[PDB]
Amino acid sequence: APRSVDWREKGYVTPVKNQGQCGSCWAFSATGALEGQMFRKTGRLISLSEQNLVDCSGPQGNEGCNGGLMDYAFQYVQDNGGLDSEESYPYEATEESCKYNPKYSVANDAGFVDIPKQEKALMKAVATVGPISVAIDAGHESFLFYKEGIYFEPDCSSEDMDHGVLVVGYGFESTESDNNKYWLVKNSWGEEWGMGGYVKMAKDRRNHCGIASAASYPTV
Ligand SMILES: *C(=O)NNC(=O)[C@H](Cc1c[nH]c2ccccc12)NC(=O)OC(C)(C)C
């Protein structure tokens, strides 16, 4: 695999969004991965509606602002036959009744692929597919205050994740501890968090924060 990857430079990634206080991280991670695969297919980057997923993908197993799973979102887009654009179905950060309109659908998928639970397999998928939806243990104050550098939390759990995010690449930089590799991760807490809304999460450190434990992407 390459030593560094960044799908933003290939046009695969929309700007950082903000989920607000709604527990809709799974919808932002899913739209991010579908934005990437739709761009891969059509050459057009179109921001997708997280509110569409929050309001409408309950029958696939999601629970709106109380949480959800990216794979359930991908299943919804397949079952539903479409997904509306962000512009047509904007984000309200609260659960409401479903308002999907097929006339404004701009994305589809035919299922999803679950990556094996190893960082080596996540690296291969990131290098060859595009941005990948992942779940991480983000439940630590160090994650809230992250400013720059490679994020490493000694209390992070590799098995108990609470937050869906999007791996858009990976790379390296020299560090004091010589733990130099990172996953380049797009969050959904706005631009003021982290590095413009991004975090470099420790890579190849025993599946830090569980980043390779629930990785997947839609098939387009
Ligand atoms: C985000 O704003 N809130 N978190 C979530 O929605 C949870 C994210 C999560 C945790 N573990 C995951 C594995 C695979 C995909 C997403 C994952 N989701 C969550 O708590 O889901 C319910 C248990 C269904 C509520």
Side-chain angles (χ1 to χ4, degrees), residues 65-83:
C65 291
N66 303 330
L69 308 184
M70 289 77 91
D71 281 359
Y72 290 166
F74 301 145
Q75 189 77 238
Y76 164 82
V77 177
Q78 182 181 23
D79 288 357
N80 191 58
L83 180 73

Side-chain angles (χ1 to χ4, degrees), residues 4 26 34 36-37 42-43 46 52-53 67 76 94 104-105 118 126 131-132 137 140 161 174 191 204-205 207 209 215:
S4 329
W26 57 271
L34 200 47
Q37 292 313 281
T42 74
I46 306 175
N52 198 154
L53 298 170
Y76 164 82
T94 188
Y104 297 92
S105 182
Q118 296 167 313
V126 174
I132 306 297
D137 175 10
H140 301 83
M161 298 85 83
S174 290
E191 268 189 294
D204 300 324
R205 305 200 60 174
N207 187 31
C209 301

Side-chain angles (χ1 to χ4, degrees), residues 19 21-28 61-72 134-136 159-164 188-189 213-216:
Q19 61 182 96
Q21 287 311 301
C22 168
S24 56
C25 63
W26 57 271
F28 286 87
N62 286 327
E63 311 186 348
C65 291
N66 303 330
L69 308 184
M70 289 77 91
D71 281 359
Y72 290 166
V134 303
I136 56 153
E159 318 308 5
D160 280 26
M161 298 85 83
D162 64 5
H163 186 45
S188 51
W189 291 357
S213 298
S216 70

Side-chain angles (χ1 to χ4, degrees), residues 16-172:
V16 170
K17 302 173 179 182
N18 198 333
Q19 61 182 96
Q21 287 311 301
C22 168
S24 56
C25 63
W26 57 271
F28 286 87
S29 170
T31 59
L34 200 47
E35 285 157 358
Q37 292 313 281
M38 289 296 318
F39 177 82
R40 181 180 181 193
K41 179 117 189 292
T42 74
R44 291 179 71 181
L45 184 62
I46 306 175
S47 183
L48 297 184
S49 169
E50 295 80 25
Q51 196 71 53
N52 198 154
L53 298 170
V54 165
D55 297 348
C56 304
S57 65
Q60 289 73 28
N62 286 327
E63 311 186 348
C65 291
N66 303 330
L69 308 184
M70 289 77 91
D71 281 359
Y72 290 166
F74 301 145
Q75 189 77 238
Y76 164 82
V77 177
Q78 182 181 23
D79 288 357
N80 191 58
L83 180 73
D84 288 335
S85 66
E86 187 85 82
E87 165 213 283
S88 84
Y89 198 157
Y91 183 63
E92 302 300 340
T94 188
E95 220 211 320
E96 34 168 37
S97 61
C98 185
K99 294 166 191 63
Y100 170 77
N101 190 153
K103 206 183 190 165
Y104 297 92
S105 182
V106 302
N108 303 87
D109 73 44
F112 58 88
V113 169
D114 283 336
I115 297 153
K117 285 141 206 315
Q118 296 167 313
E119 280 184 284
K120 277 172 261 209
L122 179 55
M123 179 171 51
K124 293 190 227 102
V126 174
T128 62
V129 175
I132 306 297
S133 293
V134 303
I136 56 153
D137 175 10
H140 301 83
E141 162 189 277
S142 50
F143 193 79
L144 288 172
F145 297 170
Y146 170 81
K147 288 184 210 299
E148 68 172 2
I150 298 184
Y151 177 78
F152 180 75
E153 170 46 67
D155 192 26
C156 229
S157 173
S158 293
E159 318 308 5
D160 280 26
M161 298 85 83
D162 64 5
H163 186 45
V165 293
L166 183 77
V167 175
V168 306
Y170 58 83
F172 66 87

